[PDB]
């Protein structure tokens, strides 16, 4: 067989120029898209101010519009999903991830408009949904739309343009190219069989988008936290511990998110009106929280800096944790077109910080700064739930710029999966596919 | 589908026995990586108390400056030709092939050979890295265990071999991320799904990184401080630089390759024609390591100086070419050493230079040569060894200028974009193909 290999080595890295050039168009498009979404989402959460503030006098009138607004949109979100693209509603990564293995379709002519405008509602309303999944999914479809419009053939051009469309997407959402790539090739890619996905092609896509994101998000990190202190070796084990905690909590949160999405399936049974209504329900609910305790509602991003800083008290952290842990499930699990990727960061950050404050007062001789742990865990809930350690660790770094904490960030997110494994649970993204994949059949 | 649905639900379940072993591997790789690193130095030290001793008599200096290197250099080649020919050279092509079950892991042989072997080539002053040397000394460590504990299976052979590699790369550049990203971008069998457990590699890499930390703390390998940033109007400049690395990519590959042939003659295959031609290039290097060190040695030490803009345009090109030579002559001469690190030094120096030009070319971009010195420190790896991702991430991991990521990728990408469109191939895969085809027949 060495006969073939010797001929394969000498044939390495020869990606069709036509392919490459298209990963460029993809990444570019994904980017512009990624931005528009991001921008549009905000623009709405804005209106949702000029609404409150206009009625800031009659308190009951606030809490009213603080509900209505979210609700109305949230509903509009769900509606555009249940009636035009059920494949959308929810993360969106399980789908694209499955579509990679040729197990689910890329109804881009449907998904794009839905997921996009659909999320503007859910997110623009104030729900506990990220923007990651939403774009990663909006991404692949972009890469697929091109694949079709230029009818590029040969699996390579279908698994590659679908993959770059993903990373292009992920990167243009956290402004993190490395993470965008490392993600596809650690999670998204068909997990059990060699594939025709050209890396060099993905990069170009990711880059193109990262630029697009740089053209409009110029001059403003998403999560500025400044250079935190360092981490001696004698304080290393503390990060293992934190990981182990994330590890046992990892699968559990997965059970919830999962079951929770079942226990919520009843309420509507499958009825569009029982959904759309239960939609604006959790929606309006969120918008309310986004004026009476924002740390429990919305994206969560904004509180990551505050948390790391040590601005939240032990009391307020635990409140924020649980509160979110709930709004998160209730929002994601309710099949709303949104993600659970970003919000997971928020949880890890908050949970880490908390761990820190305890660590600090426990060992004043380690001269700790709870902020490190807030960062050693910002991606650990990703290393236990979605079990994508590498993509996390590198996504964190890519946006917390504290490389001096890489040795600790790994020692946590590793310990994360080490216990997320040894205690049941599975890739929260893979399980969702397995189910939707199984539910596909097992019903005929 | 039914299968998949059952596979998904079966993801990430690496045998506890396996994992626990990647830990011992990484640990060992680490201590090893250190001892190697430490020993090499220790020797380059002696060569000081040696010169200083004969610092009075100049010719006497230049003499011992040759002898010492030569003597060791030979001792290196010797311990390779006569005990493990599989060593001599990078060591990555081997392990890389051994991953596809196409070469053997004569660890009971390689370990002692490559190790003490490199202490000579390196400890003497040759233009050889320490990367490959350890990545290779690595897999063998993970193999030695595989054997001593007969953990059966392919997973335990492809995994303990892999983690031993990353553990190895990591403990060499103190860059865990790189160590891992490497295996899964280059080293891993390039054309068929495999039984290598990532979660296992990590644990390995980590354990070694710790090991490196336990003995290297408080001092980086390449300290460069926070460099300026990089507006988008100056991005294309980095593309250009990538395209340059992309054309020079394969070429340097040709040389490295051919040069190792044109060097095969001199000894024919004779152990004495080698060992002698060994301390020949060796003693040569150690001479240069006292009359123009930028041409000789590892090259690391001048990466900082280069980025700073301390070298003049003149001195850079001198240093480039000079190294471009000593590099080939040293690596291509089958000496037990690597071409990974020294490739960095070239990209750095080649980048800097590009910078100083860009600077005076566009004073309105308020450029700092130092940024290009970093957008290329791993671009020669993105054209020669065609392992962009591992490079980009290995640079970051040790230059710490994430602000430059958008540039670094736009160069290294353009690197492989031209290294491709203009012939060439993974200098590490070609060496395997060669050594693999020259095998059968």
């Amino acid at each position: 067989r060495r006969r073939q290999l010797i001929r394969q080595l000498l044939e390495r890295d020869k990606t069709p120029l036509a392919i490459l050039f298209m990963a460029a168009v993809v990444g570019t498009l994904v980017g512009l898209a990624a931005v528009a979404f991001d921008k549009g989402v905000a623009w709405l959460q804005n209106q949702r101010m000029g609404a409150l503030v206009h009625t800031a006098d009659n308190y009951p009138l606030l809490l009213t519009v603080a509900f209505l607004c979210s609700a109305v949109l949230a509903m509009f979100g769900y509606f555009l999903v249940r009636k035009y693209a059920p494949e959308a509603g929810g993360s969106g990564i399980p789908e694209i991830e499955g579509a990679l293995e040729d197990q689910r379709p890329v109804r881009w002519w449907r998904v794009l408009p839905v997921k996009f405008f659909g999320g503007l509602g859910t997110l623009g309303g104030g729900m506990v949904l990220g923007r990651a999944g939403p774009t990663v999914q909006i991404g692949g479809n972009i890469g697929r739309m091109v694949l079709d419009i230029f009818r590029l053939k040969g699996d390579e051009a279908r698994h590659t343009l679908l993959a770059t469309g993903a990373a292009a997407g992920l990167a243009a959402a956290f402004n993190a190219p490395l993470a965008g790539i490392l993600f596809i090739i650690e999670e998204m890619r068909p997990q059990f069989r060699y594939t025709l996905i050209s890396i060099k092609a993905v990069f170009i896509g990711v880059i193109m988008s990262t630029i697009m994101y740089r053209i409009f998000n110029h001059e403003v990190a998403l999560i500025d936290v400044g250079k935190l202190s360092d981490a001696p070796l004698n304080t290393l084990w503390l990060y293992l511990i934190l990981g182990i905690i994330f590890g046992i909590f990892g699968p559990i949160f997965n059970k919830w998110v999962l079951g929770m999405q079942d226990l919520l399936h009843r309420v509507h049974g499958g009825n569009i009106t029982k959904w759309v209504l239960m939609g604006g329900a959790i929606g309006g609910l969120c918008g309310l929280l986004g004026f009476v305790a924002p740390a429990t509602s919305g994206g969560g991003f904004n509180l990551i800096p505050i948390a790391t800083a040590g601005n939240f008290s032990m009391g307020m952290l635990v409140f924020i944790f649980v509160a979110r842990v709930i709004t998160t499930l209730l929002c994601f699990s309710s099949g709303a077109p949104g993600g659970i990727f970003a919000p997971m960061l928020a949880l890890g950050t908050v949970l880490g910080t908390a761990f820190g404050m305890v660590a600090v007062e426990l060992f004043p001789q380690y001269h700790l700064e709870a902020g490190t742990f807030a960062i050693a865990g910002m991606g650990a809930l990703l290393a236990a739930s979605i079990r994508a350690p590498l993509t996390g660790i590198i996504l964190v770094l890519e946006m917390t710029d504290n490389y001096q904490l890489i040795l600790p960030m790994i020692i946590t997110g590793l310990g994360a999966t080490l216990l997320a494994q040894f205690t049941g649970g599975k890739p929260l993204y893979s399980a969702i596919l397995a189910r939707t994949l199984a539910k596909q059949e097992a019903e005929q | 589908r039914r299968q998949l649905i059952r596979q998904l639900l079966e993801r990430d379940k690496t045998p506890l026995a396996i994992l626990f072993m990647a830990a011992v591997v990484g640990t060992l790789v680490g201590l090893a990586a250190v001892a190697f690193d430490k020993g090499v130095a220790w020797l380059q030290n002696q060569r000081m108390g040696a010169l200083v001793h004969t610092a009075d008599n100049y010719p006497l200096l230049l003499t011992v400056a040759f002898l010492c290197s030569a003597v060791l250099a030979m001792f290196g080649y010797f311990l390779v030709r006569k005990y493990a020919p599989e060593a001599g050279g990078s060591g990555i092509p081997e392990i890389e092939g051994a991953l596809e079950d196409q070469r053997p892991v004569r660890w009971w042989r390689v370990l002692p050979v490559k190790f003490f072997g490199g202490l000579g080539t390196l400890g003497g002053g040759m233009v050889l890295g320490r990367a490959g040397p350890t990545v290779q000394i690595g897999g063998n460590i993970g193999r030695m265990v595989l054997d001593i504990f007969r953990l059966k299976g392919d997973e335990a052979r492809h995994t303990l071999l892999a983690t031993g590699a990353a553990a190895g790369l990591a403990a060499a550049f103190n860059a865990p991320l790189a160590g891992i990203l490497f295996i899964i971008e280059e080293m891993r069998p390039q054309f068929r799904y495999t039984l290598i457990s990532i979660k296992a590699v990590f644990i390995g890499v980590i354990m070694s990184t710790i090991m490196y930390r336990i003995f290297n703390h408080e001092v980086a390998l390449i300290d460069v401080g926070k460099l300026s940033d990089a507006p988008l109007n100056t991005l294309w400049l980095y593309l250009i630089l990538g395209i340059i690395f992309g054309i020079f990519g394969p070429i340097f590959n040709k040389w490295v390759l051919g040069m190792q042939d044109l060097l095969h003659r001199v000894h024919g295959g004779n152990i004495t024609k080698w060992v002698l031609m060994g301390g020949a290039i060796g003693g040569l290097c150690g001479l240069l390591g006292f009359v123009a060190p930028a041409t000789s040695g590892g090259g690391f030490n001048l990466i900082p100086i280069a980025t700073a803009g301390n070298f003049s345009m003149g001195m850079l090109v001198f240093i480039f070419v000079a190294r471009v030579i000593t590099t080939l002559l040293c690596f291509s001469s089958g000496a037990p050493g690597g071409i990974f690190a020294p490739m960095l030094a070239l990209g750095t120096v080649l980048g800097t230079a590009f910078g100083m030009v860009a600077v005076e070319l566009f004073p309105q971009y308020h450029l700092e040569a130092g940024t290009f010195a970093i957008a290329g420190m791993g671009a020669l790896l993105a054209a020669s060894i065609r392992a962009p991702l591992t490079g980009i991430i290995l640079v970051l991991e040790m230059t710490d200028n994430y602000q430059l990521i958008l540039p670094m990728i736009i160069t290294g990408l353009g690197a492989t974009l031209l290294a491709q469109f203009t012939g060439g191939k993974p200098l590490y895969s070609a060496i395997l193909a060669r050594t693999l085809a020259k095998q059968e027949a």
Partner: antibody
Amino acid sequence: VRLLESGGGLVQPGGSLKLSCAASGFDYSRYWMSWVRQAPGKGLKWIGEINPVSSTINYTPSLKDKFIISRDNAKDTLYLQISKVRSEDTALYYCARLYYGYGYWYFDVWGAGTTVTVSS
Amino acid sequence: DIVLTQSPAIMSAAPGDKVTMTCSASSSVSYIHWYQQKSGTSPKRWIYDTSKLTSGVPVRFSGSGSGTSYSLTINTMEAEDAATYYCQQWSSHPQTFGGGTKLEILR
């Protein structure tokens, strides 16, 4: 974030004055400091610019050492020496902080001012 | 050294009026800037890269132009806009400022 430049004043033709500019409210490093002067009534005319590590310093089409910009990041202070001064040198001297958008640099945060009048 | 020359040297219009000042370059420039200067104060970075209002600039102000000739505009100007506006380029070294335009309010 404040830029307070002193030094200014009265100098006799053919003289030399060291205008200072103390920065505060931000990181002096990472920053390209410059000077621009406004002649009473007239507009602005860029004088010079000196990068962080001061390994770069370019002036306007000036002479040899008419101008001599420097900086002591150890005191987050920008300097400007003017030798053999003449009436054309009587204007308001601002020290700005430089930055950019897409990359075509601008004068970010201009300091106070300081005046120099050349006269006997 | 580009020769930026701001069209109206001095102009007056009544608040709520649409005012527009020009700034032509001798050669070619791109991503112009504009600084506002009110009596007694050092210049203030208004619009940049041809049309990016600076954090604070009333959305009243708009930037524009292209290579040879740019402009700054105020849709319905307000009396607090009385000042001197200076367009400046650095798409060619050394940088260069325009002659300025003094806005005066009619009341």
